[PDB]
Each structure stands twice: as structure tokens, then as C-alpha cells.
Amino acid sequence: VLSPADKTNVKAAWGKVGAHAGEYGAEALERMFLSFPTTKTYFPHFDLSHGSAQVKGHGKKVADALTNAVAHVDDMPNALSALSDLHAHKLRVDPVNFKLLSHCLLVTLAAHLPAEFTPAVHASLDKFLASVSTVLTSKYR
Amino acid sequence: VLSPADKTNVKAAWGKVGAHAGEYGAEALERMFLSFPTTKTYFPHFDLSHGSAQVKGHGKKVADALTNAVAHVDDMPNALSALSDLHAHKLRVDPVNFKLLSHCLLVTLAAHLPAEFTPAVHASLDKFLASVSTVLTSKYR
Amino acid sequence: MHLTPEEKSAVTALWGKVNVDEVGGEALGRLLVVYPWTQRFFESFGDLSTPDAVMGNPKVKAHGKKVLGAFSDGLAHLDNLKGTFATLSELHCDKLHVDPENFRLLGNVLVCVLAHHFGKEFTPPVQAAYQKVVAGVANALAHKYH
Amino acid sequence: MHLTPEEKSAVTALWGKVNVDEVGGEALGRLLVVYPWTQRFFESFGDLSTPDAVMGNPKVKAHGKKVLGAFSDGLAHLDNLKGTFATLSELHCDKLHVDPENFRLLGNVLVCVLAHHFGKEFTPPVQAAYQKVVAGVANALAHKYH
Numbered sequence: 321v322l323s324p325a326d327k328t329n330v331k332a333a334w335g336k337v338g339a340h341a342g343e344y345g346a347e348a349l350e351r352m353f354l355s356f357p358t359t360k361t362y363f364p365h366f367d368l369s370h371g372s373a374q375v376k377g378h379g380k381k382v383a384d385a386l387t388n389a390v391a392h393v394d395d396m397p398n399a400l401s402a403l404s405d406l407h408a409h410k411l412r413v414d415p416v417n418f419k420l421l422s423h424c425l426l427v428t429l430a431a432h433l434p435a436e437f438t439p440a441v442h443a444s445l446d447k448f449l450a451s452v453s454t455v456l457t458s459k460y461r
Numbered sequence: 462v463l464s465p466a467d468k469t470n471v472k473a474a475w476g477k478v479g480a481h482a483g484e485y486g487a488e489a490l491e492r493m494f495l496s497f498p499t500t501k502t503y504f505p506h507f508d509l510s511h512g513s514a515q516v517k518g519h520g521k522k523v524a525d526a527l528t529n530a531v532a533h534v535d536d537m538p539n540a541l542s543a544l545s546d547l548h549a550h551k552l553r554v555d556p557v558n559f560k561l562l563s564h565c566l567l568v569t570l571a572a573h574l575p576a577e578f579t580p581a582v583h584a585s586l587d588k589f590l591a592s593v594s595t596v597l598t599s600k601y602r
Numbered sequence: 603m604h605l606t607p608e609e610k611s612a613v614t615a616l617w618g619k620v621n622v623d624e625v626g627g628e629a630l631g632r633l634l635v636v637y638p639w640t641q642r643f644f645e646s647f648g649d650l651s652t653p654d655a656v657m658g659n660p661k662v663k664a665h666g667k668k669v670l671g672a673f674s675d676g677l678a679h680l681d682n683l684k685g686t687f688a689t690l691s692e693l694h695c696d697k698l699h700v701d702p703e704n705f706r707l708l709g710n711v712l713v714c715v716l717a718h719h720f721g722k723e724f725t726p727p728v729q730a731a732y733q734k735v736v737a738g739v740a741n742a743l744a745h746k747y748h
Numbered sequence: 749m750h751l752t753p754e755e756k757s758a759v760t761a762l763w764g765k766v767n768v769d770e771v772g773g774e775a776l777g778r779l780l781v782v783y784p785w786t787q788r789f790f791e792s793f794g795d796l797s798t799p800d801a802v803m804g805n806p807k808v809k810a811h812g813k814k815v816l817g818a819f820s821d822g823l824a825h826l827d828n829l830k831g832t833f834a835t836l837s838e839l840h841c842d843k844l845h846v847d848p849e850n851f852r853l854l855g856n857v858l859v860c861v862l863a864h865h866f867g868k869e870f871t872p873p874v875q876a877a878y879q880k881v882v883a884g885v886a887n888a889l890a891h892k893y894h
């Protein structure tokens with residue numbers, strides 16, 4: 321459960337991401353593909369080379385979804401309904417992978433927000449990404 | 462989310478377990494300790510020898526908790542409140558370990574319910590154990 | 603893969619009682635029912651709408667038979683799983699794009715199936731030996747991923 | 749463990765700039781904050797009630813230094829992580845009763861700390877080389893568990 325302090329931490333940190341959200345989503349994917357190669361099995365149709373516009377485009381979609389989640393932190397299931405449907409019924413990404421992207425998102429944030437990435441903030445972000453992951457996988461079975 | 466059919470499946474299988482719940486709980490623990498030796502790290506104070514009273518008593522308490530959950534499948538959070546507090550604040554068992562015990566409980570049930578362990582029931586029990594695990598891990602942070 | 607002689611024997615002994623085709627179909631069908639996301643690779647198999655539809659699908663059964671036959675052959679090479687599964691590992695990565703997590707899921711479903719099939723003969727020690735094997739096979743199949 | 753020339757140099761180069769004392773304390777403190785259940789091993793350490801308490805605890809800083817120092821030693825023996833950590837593996841199992849999953853969590857937190865500390869220098873390829881190492885180390889430490 322996200323405490324009021326967790327929600328404050330998340331909105332503050334994500335606020336600072338601001339317009340760079342898309343760039344950071346792409347970087348997080350890139351980190352994921354290099355660090356955990358098995359994740360590439362879900363994108364056989366993409367050019368995964370560094371700088372790929374496909375990755376960049378996907379990065380922006382992911383980031384935009386995260387922004388929506390932050391905006392609707394008290395109402396995540398409804399805000400992410402279409403995306404939970406999509407992952408559960410079409411993409412069918414094994415649930416394990418969500419933890420890998422989450423870690424990569426955290427690393428990306430750490431590398432870009434030296435001042436904001438406090439231990440307290442780190443904890444709230446981790447909880448937040450786990451909540452998003454839970455929602456996205458909610459309708460798998 | 463446990464569907465109505467899932468609840469029916471669970472109540473049917475557990476009903477069959479009946480009076481053997483405690484013995485089954487003990488067997489699941491022994492299966493876990495043997496298959497996943499790292500789980501033994503949480504029981505250094507127990508005599509883990511086969512048929513030990515400590516394991517049989519613990520097996521019993523685990524089974525009773527499970528019975529409670531089946532009885533209150535519509536209100537698990539409330540039914541297991543005390544247990545979720547104990548695990549989060551005192552025991553502090555890493556969440557990974559819940560998946561290992563759940564697997565061993567599934568194996569135990571499969572080995573004892575030839576007639577009832579159908580693909581649909583298997584699916585429902587798996588989901589049920591996942592839900593119990595989620596509730597017990599809910600207050601960790 | 604290091605198994606004590608005791609463990610190797612527990613494995614070989616039970617396996618001799620297995621109907622490979624039957625267990626193969628059962629295990630693959632149960633994987634598809636219990637973890638439906640795994641159906642993602644099988645849309646060409648037809649009807650997977652219900653448990654009954656899955657369990658009865660001839661394509662599922664035929665694939666199960668193929669998968670378990672390879673598994674079965676691997677049991678003769680417990681000493682060299684990695685070498686034995688190298689080409690298959692490459693194929694699963696490069697051509698089939700199968701997340702290795704699926705191998706772990708199958709391994710766990712296989713253990714449940716053996717337990718259901720053998721009842722009391724599937725003792726805690728026998729399970730432990732099969733757990734090592736199933737993990738060994740999954741690791742061998744994931745080895746060439748990149 | 750298996751590292752490509754570029755991966756080894758990536759690791760070695762970054763490590764030359766790490767102040768083990770400082771990073772160690774940060775890594776352990778963050779582990780205790782982010783995954784509080786891990787505090788179960790440090791009941792005698794004092795106040796771990798809030799992030800500020802954890803981070804400023806001298807016993808946490810002390811322990812953190814001890815751990816990363818041992819970690820640093822392994823960086824010197826990348827070819828034989830298992831042989832290197834055998835003794836500590838046994839200790840962590842037999843005397844400390846630490847679930848090896850904790851090694852994995854610490855590995856992830858360390859990566860986070862390095863990224864936090866180095867910023868843009870901690871590039872995707874550098875991270876990837878560190879992920880391999882951290883996993884290698886965790887595996888080496890869990891090796892003697894029984």
C-alpha cells in the first residue's frame with residue numbers, strides 16, 4: 321500500500337522527470353535489454369540497437385503510461401485497465417519480467433536524479449513500480 | 462482475483478482434504494525443506510528430522526490458517542490480518558519463499574487427491590495459494 | 603549435473619514407469635491451463651478456449667509428446683545436460699523467442715503431474731531429485747540465450 | 749566466471765574510483781530501508797526505525813564496509829568466485845542462517861548506488877557488466893548452502 325508519504329515522494333520525483341520521461345523510458349529499456357537478455361524474446365520484431373527509434377518510441381509509451389499512473393495513483397486499476405487487458409490477453413509477458421524493467425527504471429532514475437534519489441525516495445519508487453506491476457498483471461488468469 | 466468458479470474449486474478440494482490438513486501441512490514442509498534447502502534458514506531453532514513434533518505442530522498451524530482462509534475466501538485480508546502482521550513485523554520471511562511452500566503444498570495435494578486434482582482445480586489452487594501469499598506479504602513495507 | 607547415485611536412481615526408476623506420450627500431453631495441457639500466458643506461442647493450435655478444449659487438443663498433445671520425448675532422452679545424459687541441449691537452447695532463443703521462464707513453469711507442472719500420477723510413490727526425496735533435474739534441464743535450455 | 753574483455757575492463761575501471769567505505773555503508777543502509785524485512789539479521793545494530801536512523805547508524809556503516817571489502821576481494825578473483833567465497837558461503841549458511849535471496853537484493857541495491865553515485869558514467873553496458881558480476885557473487889555465496 322502506498323502511504324501518503326509514498327505518494328508525495330513519487331509525485332515529487334516524477335515531477336522532476338518532467339519532459340525527460342520519454343528519454344528515460346528508452347534508456348530503461350536499453351538497460352533492460354543489455355542486462356537481462358531474456359527480455360529481448362518479447363521484441364523479435366524490433367531493431368534493439370542503441371539509438372533505435374523503435375525503442376525510443378516504445379520508451380515514450382511506457383513513460384507516458386507511468387505518468388498516467390502517477391496522476392491516478394489513488395485509482396490505478398481503472399486508469400491502467402486497457403493496458404492490463406493488453407498485457408494479459410495479447411502480449412502475455414511473463415510476470416517475472418516486470419521486476420526486471422522496474423529495476424532498470426530505478427537505475428535510470430538514480431543516474432539522472434542524484435539529489436532526489438534519496439533512500440526514502442528510492443523505497444517509495446520501488447513500492448510504486450511494484451504496484452504498477454501488480455496492476456498490469458492483474459488479469460493474467 | 463479469485464473467480465466464483467475458483468472459490469468453488471478450492472472449497473471442494475479443501476473439503477476433501479478434511480481431517481488430513483495437518484498431516485498434509487507437515488508433508489508439504491518436509492517436501493520444501495528437502496527440495497529447497499535455503500528455506501531451512503528460517504528454522505534453525507527446529508528439529509527438522511523427519512516426523513519431528515515441531516514440524517508436525519507447525520504443519521498443523523499452517524493447515525489451520527489455510528482452512529481459515531478457505532472459510533473466508535471472500536475476506537482473506539481480514540481473516541489473515543494477524544498472520545500478515547506476524548510475517549511482516551516479526552518473522553520477516555523473504556517473499557520468494559512463499560512461492561516455494563505453495564508449490565510444495567500443490568505437490569502434496571496432487572499426491573493425495575487423485576480424483577480431485579483436475580487441470581481446472583490445479584489452476585484454482587495455484588491462484589488460491591498465490592492470493593494467500595500476497596495477503597501474508599502485504600504489510601512488509 | 604551433480605546428483606548422488608541415490609538421486610540418479612530415484613529418477614531413472616520412476617521414469618521407467620512413465621507413459622511419455624501421456625505425461626507429455628498432460629504436462630503441456632496443464633501448463634496452458636494453469637499459466638494461460640504460455641498459450642502465446644500456440645495460436646496455430648486452434649481451440650484453447652477452455653480447460654477441456656486445451657486438454658483435448660490434438661496439437662497440444664502432439665507438441666507435449668515432442669517436448670517430453672526430448673526431456674526423456676536428456677535423462678540418459680544427466681552428466682552433460684548443457685552439451686545435450688545446446689542446439690535446442692539456440693533454437694528456442696534465436697528462432698522461437700521463448701522466455702526461459704516458461705521452462706521453469708513447465709518443470710514445476712511436470713513435478714505436479716508426476717505427483718498426481720504416482721501418488722505416495724512420489725516421496726519427498728524423489729521429488730527433491732526431480733526438482734534438481736527439472737532445474738538442470740531449464741538451465742541447460744537457457745544457457746545459449748543472448 | 750565468464751566475462752568478455754570489454755565487460756572486465758568496464759568493471760575494473762569503475763571499481764578503481766569506488767571508495768569502498770562510503771559505497772558499502774550506502775548499499776547496506778539502502779537495503780535495510782528499501783527491503784526492511786532484511787533488518788531481521790541486524791537486531792543488535794541499534795536504531796533502524798527510520799531512513800535517517802539507518803543511514804546514520806555507525807554499526808550499519810561498519811558492517812557495510814566489511815561486506816564491500818569482501819566484495820572487492822572477489823573482484824580480484826573473477827575467474828573463481830566459488831573458490832573465493834567458499835568459506836564465507838559456509839559461514840552465511842551454517843552460522844548466520846542468511847537466506848541467499850538477500851545476496852540478490854544487495855546486488856540490485858549496489859547497482860542502484862553505483863548509478864546514483866556515478867550518473868552518466870554508469871552506462872547501459874557498464875550496468876550490464878555489473879549485473880553479471882553481482883549475480884556471480886550471489887551465486888558464489890549461496891554455493892555451499894545445504
Ligand code: HEM
Pocket residue numbers: 359362363378381382385386403406407411413417418419421452453456
Ligand atoms: C511498468 C511496466 C510496463 C508498462 C507501464 C508498459 C506499458 C506499455 C505500453 C503503454 C505499451 C504500448 C501499448 C499500445 O501499443 O497501445 C506496451 C506494449 C508492449 N509492452 Fe508493456 N509495459 C510494461 C512492461 C513490459 C515488460 C516488462 C515487457 C517485456 C519485457 C513488455 C512488453 C511489451 C511489448 C512487447 C509491447 C508491444 C510493443 C510493440 O509491438 O510496439 N511490457 N507496454
Ligand code: HEM
Pocket residue numbers: 500503504519522523526527544547548552554558559562593594597
Ligand atoms: C501459505 C503460506 C504460509 C502460511 C499460511 C503460514 C502460516 C503460519 C502460521 C499459522 C504460523 C504460526 C503462528 C503462531 O505461532 O501463532 C507461522 C509461523 C512461522 N512461519 Fe509462516 N506461513 C506461511 C509461509 C511461511 C514460509 C514460506 C516460511 C519460511 C520459509 C514461514 C516461516 C515461518 C516461521 C519461521 C514461523 C515461526 C514458527 C515457530 O517459531 O514456531 N512461513 N506461519
Ligand code: HEM
Pocket residue numbers: 640643644668669670672673690694698700704705708739743
Ligand atoms: C523441457 C522443456 C522443453 C524441451 C525439452 C523442448 C523441446 C523442443 C523440441 C525437441 C522441439 C522441436 C524442435 C525442432 O523443431 O527441431 C521444440 C519446439 C518448440 N518448442 Fe520447446 N521444449 C521445451 C519447452 C518449451 C516450452 C515451455 C515452450 C512454450 C511454452 C516451448 C515452445 C516451443 C515451440 C513454440 C516450438 C515449435 C513447435 C513447432 O514448430 O511445431 N518449448 N521444443
Ligand code: HEM
Pocket residue numbers: 786789790814815816818819836840844846850851854885889
Ligand atoms: C555481497 C554479499 C556479502 C558479502 C561478501 C558478505 C561478507 C561478510 C563478511 C566478510 C562478514 C564478517 C565475517 C566474520 O565475522 O568473520 C559477514 C558477516 C555477516 N553478514 Fe554477510 N556479506 C554479504 C551479504 C550479506 C547480506 C545481504 C546479509 C543480510 C542482509 C548479510 C548478513 C551478515 C551478518 C548478519 C553477518 C554477521 C555480522 C555480526 O557478527 O554482527 N551479509 N558478511
